[PDB]
C-alpha cells in the first residue's frame with residue numbers, strides 16, 4: 354500500500370529537511386509579497402499644488418521645499434487646494450510636490466485625497482488577482498504536474514515583480530500587480546500542497562505549523578528589512594528577487610510521488626522513491642467536487658469558514674491601529690498562538706482548538722462591542738485576543754482543509770476555498786463602512802455572531818485524524 358512503500362523510505366530524512374527549508378523560504382517570500390502593499394504606500398509629510406506664478410516664484414525658491422510648503426496654501430496638509438496668482442484658494446489637478454525624501458508609490462503615481470480610491474483599489478485588485486489565481490491555478494496544477502507549475506508560477510512572480518518595479522504609469526502597474534497576485538497565489542498554494550504531500554501522515558502538523566511560522570517570520574522581517582533599502586524600487590526589487598533564486602533549483606524538490614502514482618505513469622514514481630532512498634481521470638471537475646452529498650456538505654462548511662474567518666480578521670485589524678515598532682510587535686505577537694497549536698495537536702482532536710478559537714474570537718468581538726466610553730486598555734487587549742484567536746484559526750484551517758479533499762483533486766478544492774477567502778477580503782471594507790455608517794460597533798457584533806456560527810459548524814467535520822490521505826472516491830469514509 355502507498356503507506357508501506359513510504360514506510361520503507363525514511364519518514365524524515367536530511368533531504369526532506371532540506372526541501373522543507375527551501376519551500377519555507379518560498380513561503381516567507383510569499384509573506385513578503387502580501388505585506389508589501391502597506392509599507393509600499395506611506396503618506397508623505399506634506400503635498401500641495403502648483404501654479405504658473407507659483408512655479409515662477411519657486412524657480413527662485415526651489416531649494417528647501419518646506420519653505421514652499423510654509424509659503425504655499427496650508428489647505429486650512431494640502432487638502433488638495435491651490436492658490437491663484439484673501440487670494441483664490443481653489444483645488445487643483447496637477448503640479449504636486451512632496452517634501453519627503455523617502456520615495457513612495459503614492460508620490461510617484463500622484464495618489465491624492467480625490468485619488469486615494471485607487472490607493473485602496475490596489476489592494477482590492479491584488480485580492481481579486483489572488484482569487485482568480487486560486488481559481489485558475491488549482492485546475493492547472495491538477496491537470497499538469499505540481500512541481501513544474503510551482504517553478505512556472507515562481508518565474509511569473511519574478512517577472513511580474515520586475516515589471517511592476519519598472520512600471521512607467523498606473524494602469525500597467527495595476528495589471529501587472531494583478532498578474533503578480535495570481536502567480537503568487539499559485540506558487541504559495543502549490544508549495545503548501547507539495548510540503549503536505551511529501552511527508553508521511555504523522556509529522557504533517559509540524560509541517561503546516563512551521564510553514565505558518567515562516568510566514569510570521571517573513572512579516573517579522575518586513576519591518577526590519579524596510580528600514581534599510583528605503584527607495585521604493587529597492588524594496589520592490591528585494592521582494593521580487595528571491596523568486597528567481599527559487600526558480601534556480603529544479604534538481605532538488607522532485608515531483609510528489611503520491612500524486613505521480615495516479616495511473617498516469619506509476620513507473621516514474623518508483624524511480625523518484627529510489628532517488629529519495631539515499632538515506633536508507635482526464636481532469637478534475639466541479640460536478641465531481643460537489644456531487645457527493647457528505648463531501649458537498651464538507652466543502653460548503655469549509656468555504657463558509659474561510660469566508661467568515663477572513664472577514665472577521667479584516668474587521669478586527671481595521672478596528673486596530675508608529676510605522677515600524679507597531680509592525681514588529683504585531684509580527685512577534687503571532688508566534689505564541691502558532692506554538693500553542695503546534696503543542697496541542699496529536700493530544701486532542703483537530704476541530705476542537707479551531708472551535709475554541711472561533712468561540713474566543715466571537716466573545717472578544719462581543720466584549721469589544723460594549724463599554725464604548727470606558728478605558729482603552731481592556732478593549733485593546735480583548736481585540737488583540739480575538740485577533741490572535743482568528744489567526745490561530747487560520748493555521749488549523751489549512752491542515753484540515755488539505756485532509757478532507759481527495760488526492761485526485763487536492764489543489765482544486767483548496768484553491769476554491771482560498772478564492773472565497775480572497776473574495777471576502779475584497780468585500781470586507783465596503784460592508785464595514787456601510788454597517789458603521791448606521792451605528793458604531795454593529796459590524797463587530799455581526800462578525801461575532803458569524804464566528805460563533807462558524808465555530809458551531811466546524812464540529813460537523815470528521816476529525817481528520819490518523820486516516821492518512823484519501824484516494825479518489827475513498828474521501829467519503831465518514
Ligand SMILES: C[C@]12C[C@H](O)[C@H]3[C@@H](CCC4=CC(=O)CC[C@@]43C)[C@@H]1CC[C@@H]2C(=O)CO
Pocket residue numbers: 387483565568569572687744747748775
Ligand atoms: C494569518 C497569517 C497571515 C495572513 O492572514 C494569511 C494567513 C494564511 C491565509 C492567507 C492567505 C491570503 O491569501 C491572505 C493572507 C492570509 C489570510 C496566515 C496564517 C498565519 C499568518 C500569521 O500568523 C500572520 O499574521
